[PDB]
Every structure is written in structure tokens, then in C-alpha cells.
Design a protein around this ligand. Sequence first.
Ligand SMILES: Nc1ncnc2c1ncn2[C@@H]1O[C@@H](COP(=O)(O)OP(=O)(O)NP(=O)(O)O)[C@@H](O)[C@H]1O
Ligand SMILES: Nc1ncnc2c1ncn2[C@@H]1O[C@@H](COP(=O)(O)OP(=O)(O)NP(=O)(O)O)[C@@H](O)[C@H]1O
Ligand SMILES: Nc1ncnc2c1ncn2[C@@H]1O[C@@H](COP(=O)(O)OP(=O)(O)NP(=O)(O)O)[C@@H](O)[C@H]1O
Ligand SMILES: Nc1ncnc2c1ncn2[C@@H]1O[C@@H](COP(=O)(O)OP(=O)(O)NP(=O)(O)O)[C@@H](O)[C@H]1O
Ligand SMILES: [Mg+2]
Ligand SMILES: [Mg+2]
Ligand SMILES: [Mg+2]
Ligand SMILES: [Mg+2]
Length: 1190
Amino acid sequence: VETISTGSLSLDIALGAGGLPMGRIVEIYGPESSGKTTLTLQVIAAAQREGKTCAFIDAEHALDPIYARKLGVDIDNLLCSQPDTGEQALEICDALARSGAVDVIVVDSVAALTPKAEIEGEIGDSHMGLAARMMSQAMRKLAGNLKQSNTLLIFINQGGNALKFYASVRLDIRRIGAVKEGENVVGSETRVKVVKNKIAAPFKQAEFQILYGEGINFYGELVDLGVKEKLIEKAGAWYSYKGEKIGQGKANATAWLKDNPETAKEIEKKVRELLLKQKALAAALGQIEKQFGKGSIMRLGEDRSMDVETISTGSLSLDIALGAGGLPMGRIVEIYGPESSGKTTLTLQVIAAAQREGKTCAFIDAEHALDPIYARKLGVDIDNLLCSQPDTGEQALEICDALARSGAVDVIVVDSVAALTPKAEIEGEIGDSHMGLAARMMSQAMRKLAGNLKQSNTLLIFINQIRMKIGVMFGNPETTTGGNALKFYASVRLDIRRIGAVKEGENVVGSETRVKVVKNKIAAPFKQAEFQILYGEGINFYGELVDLGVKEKLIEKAGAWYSYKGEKIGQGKANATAWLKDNPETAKEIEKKVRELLLKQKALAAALGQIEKQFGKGSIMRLGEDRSMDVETISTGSLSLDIALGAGGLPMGRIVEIYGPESSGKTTLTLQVIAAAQREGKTCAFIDAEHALDPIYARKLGVDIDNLLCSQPDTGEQALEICDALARSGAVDVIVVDSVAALTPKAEIGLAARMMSQAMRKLAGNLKQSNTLLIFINQGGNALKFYASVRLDIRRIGAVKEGENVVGSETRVKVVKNKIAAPFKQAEFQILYGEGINFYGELVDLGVKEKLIEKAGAWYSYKGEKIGQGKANATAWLKDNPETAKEIEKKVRELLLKQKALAAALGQIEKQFGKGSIMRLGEDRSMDVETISTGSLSLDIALGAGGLPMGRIVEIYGPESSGKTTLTLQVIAAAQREGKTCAFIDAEHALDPIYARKLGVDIDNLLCSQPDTGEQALEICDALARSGAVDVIVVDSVAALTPLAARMMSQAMRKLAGNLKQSNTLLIFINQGGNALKFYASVRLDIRRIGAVKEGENVVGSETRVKVVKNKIAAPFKQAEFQILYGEGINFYGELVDLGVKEKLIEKAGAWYSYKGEKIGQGKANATAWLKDNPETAKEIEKKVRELLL
Ligand SMILES: Nc1ncnc2c1ncn2[C@@H]1O[C@@H](COP(=O)(O)OP(=O)(O)NP(=O)(O)O)[C@@H](O)[C@H]1O
Ligand SMILES: Nc1ncnc2c1ncn2[C@@H]1O[C@@H](COP(=O)(O)OP(=O)(O)NP(=O)(O)O)[C@@H](O)[C@H]1O
Ligand SMILES: Nc1ncnc2c1ncn2[C@@H]1O[C@@H](COP(=O)(O)OP(=O)(O)NP(=O)(O)O)[C@@H](O)[C@H]1O
Ligand SMILES: Nc1ncnc2c1ncn2[C@@H]1O[C@@H](COP(=O)(O)OP(=O)(O)NP(=O)(O)O)[C@@H](O)[C@H]1O
Ligand SMILES: [Mg+2]
Ligand SMILES: [Mg+2]
Ligand SMILES: [Mg+2]
Ligand SMILES: [Mg+2]
């Protein structure tokens, strides 16, 4: 029968037929990127140059028109099938088989022929085996509709045992080499095996080459074939054709048969024999059209764009490649693209053009992104934009359903696929927690949206991304790494990328983008559009505009010059661009010229409140709305934050996430609300996983530290669970959690962001019935993103200088999630070291924009009265008379806005978990434990307990040469001082025994180790924990215990935890590291050297501050200062003097120190070494302070 040339010579040869059998089914299978599609596009070429009109059944949405062109396909005369489903696909190809004169059909690809079933939800029992049965189905029916037409059908594969037997021929293409030009990639040595042949002989294989951007090289193989078949003679290097010399090497031998057409064709043949009407279409087309919905197959080179309604993308060159001149009103559009590609700009740009034509639009936001200010420069009327911030994946998808059945919502924008994270994930509900399974949630409420949008003319847009990734792999792009469904139910599909970026000299102010239209059931698919996107300006309207008035000779390219009807307009695209900018109409007409040359509040105001009734109160609104749901508010501290919050403070009994980088301000603000609350009565709780909190700073910020509740939990879980019952009290009005990331679970004591998901939903409710406001802090797990009622974005931007001195951080808070009022509004303000949020600073600014204070360029006036010059000097004038302040304070507010349950539920928590893991911070109440003296005095006072808790864990940390070691050795000393024997695990290979002696240890009774490995050390002290009364152990230092330098720890950390509470044995770790321990301590210390003690000229000291950071023994966050004398040790008398001062026993007369009216010392210095010389009257003060703080 009839045969079509493969494009390769030897493929034809191994086929036995000199081509691929017409009227049969032919399968080409093999690893991806092996030349599958090239070989394909090659037969479409060889047949295309013989009339034989061809069909391309496309589900890959791949195909490079350009690469095709150079392979040699009459693109303008090719039929492609952009099917709606795998079924429909496997029927359109059938329908063409029947229609006589449609010659060869190509399906791309078997794998992407995803069943109508999958496109929805559901299931089978030959399943994913559902395709192998959609195959088995309309296959017989095709098998015979081909021997009818001589119609050749070619299937491309990599899943369906039916196709196997109905194929008359099968090919095993694989990339097995590569071809070089000395120093380059350019080649791909390919190997094709004939597996199935009922046309001649099977099992024969044939080899050839593929060139990047040129295709199969049969001339290449021709030479080689002429070699073995006598016709061509090889004289070593110079190749021959019987006397007539042809070239040098294989490089020129091939390069010659290119210049000589006729002589080649001759040899071609001589080898072959030595081995081996137009309305049957056009009528039968409109047929498949009417039969399956209008436009779902076509020739590619067509001026036919149906006149369905068009909305401008913002880019001319996009509208152009769309075909229709805008996006299809009443359809689904997926714009996918690599993160930070430009997608959303283009997205906001459609919102732009539609809003400028009277229409009103929807924004379904699961990203919490959207820069209002940028949108406003972009062209979007933010005030009228309908914004939705859904509680969840499905819930989001269902809010569209009903914005479709409105009709006067014109365009819906969904941000974005990947971020529409479903219920099951939000709860943590396992089995397919396996996130990327609930893509079936897409397939679900998808089907229905199709209709609801079409009979509204509501245009909907989806945004996606793609996977290559866990984090970083090197596998390959699978179209749309959201869900399988959308891939078909989209009427049009966009691939925005980024390739260039552009410059204003050396600045980077641009981004060169490329949008590919890959799925197009409006017109010409696979058309593309390059243009520019400018930071803070938008799409380069004029940019592309020029480029078009090039090709449609309206603006004349005179090399580097740009002319408009004789008169010169710009040199270099640069100025041309920006010329049109200043003569708008001349452009907007040239616009129109290329567009000629290539192309009630009745129903709304009602269907709005319809969703608020059905889907939780206020789950959508115009962004410009004044309407705040009236629920009670706690002031953030920053007026401008309150304001942009919408409600005037944080929502009561709802969850709030404040996040940001480290050192942003997130805590200052956090502490500020705890303040503002405490000064209204309402009492607060602080759950601490961070052990951060500066008491002194809080005190100066305005926090009643004494009456604040602190909880230093052992496990994240436990932490949360504490909030649980702190919610069921109604007497904790504000809980603060520092911080999400640090709430590391028991399991870890990576994956368990699940813990966050857990007791989340239960805690959500308990707060509305308590007004218990809970605030989280992040830098976390997916659940919070949603259950939060308000999400805050603090970042630090600038700095504040007093003359020339860094005394402040200029901050910016952005309300990115707001289900209490208007979202996306922002507020900027000052934070000052040691004073906090700058009330007055923003107050001035407010009164300027609310016209109470008058800006005379640089001068600041308050009605007649001139109150300052330069923001600063004015700021600090309201600080000078709070009279006028408190008046303007309010006038701006006006222009923009028992102890039964407590004193009981407290101890309940102590009983439920651990005794003493919550308390008031200003508490005498210490507990009973054996306490070793730390060596200090004020330390053992700041501990509250008398010293370190026997048989718990204690971590001391801080910078190198801080005094870490010394401190410990001072403890070992004052254990030695009462029998308690000691071992000192000296991993560091530190310690100068000599020095040690000088500090006061019994050198000979401190039996100690110099371990080789981290482990040895661990299991050494492990065995000393069990070893009865060996009474305290110091590990110096966690440092040389990088061998999972915490997975190793978390091991024996569990073990030493319960071997100590047994032996009373106490363990002190030192650090500079390795998590777990952080929690497994009952006390933590922050040492730091901050001074130095001189004796005129000698560095003989180190002034030292130790903060009690973690204290599950008594009151935490207390601090103590003292002198450490090099080669003597801590200063008994040093800190003693000081204590006796603050306890009215020794009296400070400026520089003079007094005792019973008696002069004892001038300058702390001499005062000290006085008490050294009067032990009697010293020891006597010792006690009387010990009586007053122990
Ligand atoms: N735009 C292009 N520029 C240069 N070379 C290309 C281009 N497109 C394809 N190629 C070449 O062809 C590729 C082979 O695979 P191809 O012919 O596209 O079949 P395929 O395996 O079906 N592709 P896919 O199904 O997407 O994995 C590469 O090895 C390149 O050599
Ligand atoms: N404030 C801004 N100033 C300058 N350019 C901006 C600003 N905001 C956004 N852009 C532009 O928008 C970016 C393109 O990405 P965008 O349009 O946000 O799509 P996106 O990929 O959805 N972002 P994301 O979803 O966060 O990964 C940048 O390349 C900028 O061109
Ligand atoms: N002891 C202090 N002295 C001076 N300034 C301080 C002190 N403690 C905090 N600050 C200020 O607060 C910081 C801002 O970050 P902060 O309010 O601590 O939130 P944070 O990011 O949660 N801290 P962290 O959890 O350690 O990353 C700095 O910018 C300082 O302006
Ligand atoms: N041989 C010595 N004689 C006297 N004083 C010393 C001697 N060695 C160190 N010092 C001082 O006293 C030390 C106390 O610091 P130290 O207790 O070693 O802290 P550290 O953090 O454990 N050091 P490192 O282990 O290197 O991180 C430092 O302050 C030194 O300045
Ligand atoms: Mg392809
Ligand atoms: Mg966005
Ligand atoms: Mg803090
Ligand atoms: Mg040391």
C-alpha cells in the first residue's frame, strides 16, 4: 500500500516499506525529550509538501510554531485539536478519520488524553486504569475508519494496553548520544527501534541524528548509506563519487549534497531498491464544530476570530496573539507562570481595562499579596474592587459559583490555584494531608462553574505556578502545578515568563517578559507576545506600540532613527517609546490603526449580602468601604495602625498573626498591645518559647510586668494546650505567643507544622465565648493563614538620627489579611529605642493630612500659632503640652473612626501539666528545691530560689570570653564547699587547673574527663546521672559536640531528663547551637561581659550581667550584675555593697558610702575593700539581706 517518508532515510529502511503505512495506527513511544515530537513534525512535513492536509490532536499544548516552520511544515495549513477532554479528543480524531480526505492525524499525547472522568472526581478497578479502558473503547471504531480513508494515525507515548494491538507499527525512539562541533552541544544522536511490523519484517533498528533548530539530517545518513552500498567511495578522509571528488571529512560530504539537489535524489532511490473535493473538508469541519461547541478544531493560519466579547489584557501584542483582541467574556482563563514572572501585573492590568469600561470586578485572594498602591499606579480603581479573603479552598471556589449567578460581576480573579489550600489540609486530617492530592477539590466545583459564568458573561481568571520541586531537584515542568481539571475547562491559557530586565543606564528598572498563549479555543493557539514590564509603571503600552508601527508601516525605521511621516520622532527605541508618551492621541490613533489592521445596582447590592448571609459575616467587600462590623477593639498603640486596621484596634476573641523578619518591631508592637490592654484592666498572658522579653524595655513601654502572665512551656503542643484552657476562663483577655516558629513539637524534641493545624480549630471557638484575643508571631504552619481574622506585616525600612546617632527604626505595618473591615490598607510610624512606638510622631502627620495642622512648605502651624519647623521639632512640641495634643488626638479619631474564674482556673493548669509552668511575674512564690549557690549572690536572688535547682537541667550561654566557664567553676567551688562531689566534662580541652584552683575548686576531688567524641561525653554523664550521689555535672561545652548535632542530643536529652529527677544530680550545659535543651532546662542563663574593672591602668576585671532567661523554678526574666576578678573569682563583697545600698543598710551620699551615720568608703571601689577588712560587720549585713530576699 501507500507510504509516507518518516523524515529519516534509515527509518524508512528498517520499516521495510519506505515509510509509514497509510490507513493504519502507528505508535511512537519512548522517554521524553528523545525527539519524539521532531520525528512527528517531520512526517507532517514530508506529507505537507504533497497536499495531504493534516491533523494535530493536541493535549500537550507544547509545539513550537517556529521550530515547526524550520522543520518544514505548512503551519498555516495545519489542523490542530484543542480538545475539551480525552474522550472528546478520541472522537474528533475519529470524526476526521471518517471524513475521507483528511490524510494524516497526530495525537499529542497519549499520556495527556486524560479521561472525562478524571477531569471530574471519581474512581474504577482497572483505575488510572480508566484510560486503558477509554482506549479499549472508541478503538475498534477507529481501527476501521482508517483503512476506509487511507487515513494514517500516529500516537505518541512514554499506559493503555488496547492501543498496543491495533497499531500496525510501533517505534522505540531514544536519545542515546549527542553530536559535537568540537566544543558544543548542538547534536542528539538518536536510535529508533522497530518493535511492531505487520507491514514487513519487525526487530530491525536504525540510527541517525537531530540538530537543535534544524531537525532530522537524511543527507547525514545518506553519505553513510552510500558508503556501505558501493555508490560512494571512501578514500580515507576525502569522500568520492566515482572520480568526481565531493568533499573532505563527513562534515563537508554532508555539506555538499545540500548544494546539489538532483544528484542526491538519484542516489537516494538506488539505495531504497537495494534493501526494502475541498468541501469534503470545509463542510465536514463546521460539522465537528457545531457538534462539539463552537471552535474546537482549526487550521492554524487563519484570520478567523469569532466575535465573542473581548477584554483588553493591557498589552496590544497579547491581544494580537490571543487572536480575539482580548480575553473571552464569560469563560475560564488560567494564567500560569514561574513565581515573580509578572503574572499578577498582567492580572491587575485586565482588572484595569475592564474597570475603565464601567464594569465591576472580583478578587478572590488566598495569597494575601496585592499591592494596592501599585494597582493604583497600574490603573485599577481600588475603591470599587470587590475583594474576597476566603476562610478556605473549597469555600473560595464556592464564592465564585454565586458571584457567577449575579451577572453584574463582570470579571473574577482568583489568587491563586496553589494557595486555595483545601479543608482537609487546614484541619490536618490525614490520609491525603498528602497535599498535593486534594487537586480533586478543583475537579469538583469546576464542572459547575463552566455554565454559571457563560450565562452571566462573568469572566474568570485563575493564576498557577508549576512544580520542578520538593525544594530543588532537576526533573522537569509538568504543565500547571495545581490540578488536572483546569487544564481543559480553561477556554484560554497563558504562559508568562521573564527573560531580560532593562536598564536606565546602570539601574535595573525593567523586566522583559514573554507571554505564550498555549491553550486557545478562541482562535490561533501557540501564538506569542514579547514586551516590557516596568517597575512602578506597569506594562509598556508605548513600548510594544512602537514595535507594531514598525511592522505595519506607520512609523518608519531608518536604521536607528524613528520617523513619523517624514518628520523625525526618536533615535533608538528608547526615545521613540517615550515620544509617544507625550503626544497621546497620535499614539492612541496609531493604536486604533493597528487595531483596524489586525482585528443594575438592583441585582448587585442584593446578591452581595447574599454571601454574607451564607458564608460567614463579611467575606467580601468593596475596598473603598467605610463599613466596619462593630466588634470591640484594643488599640495597637499606633494610631495609624488602628486606622488602617479599619476597626480601630485588634478584634476581640479572634486570632491575629503578626509576622515579619527578625528585628522588625514585631515584639515592640506585641508588647504595646499587652500594655494598652493592661491599662484598661483586661489581663493578659504571654506564652514564651523564645525566652527573649526585655523586662526593662517592657516596663518603659508601659507594661505592668508584675501582673502579666508568663508561661514557659516544655512543648509546642503543651504551649498551645495551655492557651486552650486559658481561653476557657474568660479572664484572660489577651494571649500572646512568641513565637510560631519556636513552638517546636514533642516529636522534634521539618514536617510537624501539623501540630499547629491540630488544636487550632478548637481554640478558634473558645475565644469568641471569652473575648480572649490571641496573637501569634511568625517569620510556621498553613492553618494559621486562614483561621486568623487579622494578619499584620511589620518590616523595618529606615532609621532615625538625632544629629548623627542611630536612635530609631522607621517601620511599616501592612494589614494583609482583614476579615474585620477593609483589608490591604497600610500605616507607617516610628519606633524609638527605650520609649517605643512614637504616638506623637504619627499624630503630627495625621493632623497634616486631616488639615488640623498646616504645612507651610517647611513650617508647622496650629491655627494662627506656629508650632514647629521640620517634622522633628514639631513632633516634640505636642510632647511639650499634652493639652492640645489630647484634643487633636480625639478630633482625628472622630474624623476616621469576678476574680472567681481567675483565682481558681490558674492552679488548674499547674495540676494538669507541670507544677509551675505559668505564673504572675511579680511573685514571691518560689518552690521547694535543693538549691546550689551559683557563686554570685544577686544571681541566686534573681533566680528567686536561692540557686540552681537540684536534679533538673540548666543551660548557661553567651559569647566567647564572656565568663561562661568561670561561672560554672564558681559553682563547682561552692558545691565543693559542702561535700557534693563534681565532675566536669571538658569536651573543649579548656580549663587551666591552676586557674581553677585559684577560683576555689578542690582540684583533686573534681574527677573529670577529656572525651574524644560528643557521644562518649554524653553517655559518660548519662552513666553519672544514674551513678547515685555524684552531685553535680558541668559540660563544657555543647560546642565541640557537632558529632544531626541535635538529633544526637535529643537522644540522651530525654534520658538524662529522668535520670536526674531520680538522683538529685544537677546538670549544667554551656553554649555560645543545638535546640532541644532549650526546653529541657528548668533554668537558663544569659551571661555577657559588659565593662571591665580597672585599677588605674590594669585590666584586672570583667563587669558582668547575667539574665535569667528561662525559669521554671520561680519568677523568670530577672537579672543580676557583678564583678568577676581575674584569678580570684566572683566578688562576694562587690555585689554585697550594692545590695546593702538598695536595702537601706548602707546609704549613698553621691560618692560617699555610709554605715550607721559612720563614713566607710568614697567610690564603690574603696567601699568594697572596706567590707573585706571588717568581716564581722560584713557577715552581719550578709544575713540581713538574705532575710530580706530569701
Ligand atoms: N525550540 C527548540 N529549540 C531548539 N531545539 C528544540 C526546540 N524544541 C525541541 N527541540 C529539540 O527536540 C527535543 C526532543 O524532543 P521533542 O522532539 O520535543 O519530543 P518530545 O520528547 O515529545 N517532547 P516532550 O513530550 O515535551 O517531552 C530536544 O532534544 C531538542 O533537541
Ligand atoms: N511595588 C512595586 N514596585 C515595582 N514593581 C512591582 C511592584 N509590585 C509588583 N511589581 C512588578 O510585579 C512583579 C511581577 O510579578 P507579579 O505581577 O506580582 O506576579 P506573581 O508571579 O503572581 N507574584 P507572586 O505570586 O508573589 O510570585 C515584578 O516583576 C514587578 O515587575
Ligand atoms: N534592650 C533593648 N534596647 C534597645 N532597643 C531594643 C531592646 N530590645 C528591643 N529593642 C528594639 O526592638 C527591636 C525590634 O524587634 P523586636 O521588637 O524585638 O521584635 P522581634 O523581631 O520579635 N525580636 P526576635 O524575636 O529576637 O527576632 C529593635 O529594632 C530595637 O529597636
Ligand atoms: N589563665 C588565665 N588566667 C587569668 N585569667 C584568664 C585566664 N584565661 C582566661 N582568663 C580571663 O577569664 C576568662 C573567663 O572567660 P571564660 O570563662 O573562659 O569564658 P568562655 O566563654 O568559657 N571561653 P571559651 O571557652 O574560649 O568560649 C576570660 O574572661 C579571660 O579574659
Ligand atoms: Mg509535543
Ligand atoms: Mg498578587
Ligand atoms: Mg519578646
Ligand atoms: Mg570554657
